[PDB]
Amino acid sequence: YDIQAWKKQCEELLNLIFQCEDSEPFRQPVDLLEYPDYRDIIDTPMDFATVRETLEAGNYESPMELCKDVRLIFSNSKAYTPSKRSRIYSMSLRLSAFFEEHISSVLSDYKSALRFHKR
Numbered sequence: 001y002d003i004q005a006w007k008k009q010c011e012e013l014l015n016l017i018f019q020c021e022d023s024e025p026f027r028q029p030v031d032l033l034e035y036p037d038y039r040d041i042i043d044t045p046m047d048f049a050t051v052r053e054t055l056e057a058g059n060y061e062s063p064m065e066l067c068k069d070v071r072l073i074f075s076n077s078k079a080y081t082p083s084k085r086s087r088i089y090s091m092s093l094r095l096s097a098f099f100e101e102h103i104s105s106v107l108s109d110y111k112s113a114l115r116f117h118k119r
């Protein structure tokens with residue numbers, strides 16, 4: 001029922017994501033010279049370095065907020081891809097599956113801890 005435990009659990013999961021070769025395209029913001037039309041398609045860029053820095057700054061209140069930003073990385077890739085058979089989109093789908101498999105317990109434990117706190 002530790003309502004702070006999610007933060008280190010998220011740090012550790014980001015560390016695992018950074019070790020995954022599938023995270024390579026998502027570790028830093030998209031560059032607007034290599035993909036010059038990116039901001040015509042994507043309103044809110046997001047990447048894993050920005051997620052880690054937001055966490056480490058103490059600017060997430062909950063793991064749900066972190067989860068929303070990570071899911072934005074993946075929805076941006078799906079929106080920008082020219083094909084469902086894209087290399088970088090295909091990497092995003094594997095990485096999303098990995099993320100979702102690991103974040104589920106972090107969310108459940110946090111929400112349970114908070115329900116206990118407010119019992």
Ligand SMILES: O=C(Nc1ccc(F)cc1F)N1CCN(C(=O)c2ccco2)CC1
Nearest residue numbers: 025028029030031034077080081086088089
């Ligand atoms: O090259 C990058 N990011 C990047 C990373 C580090 C850098 F230094 C410079 C970069 F531009 N892509 C990431 C995700 N990508 C897609 O989601 C997508 C789907 C189909 C085709 O691209 C858009 C472009």
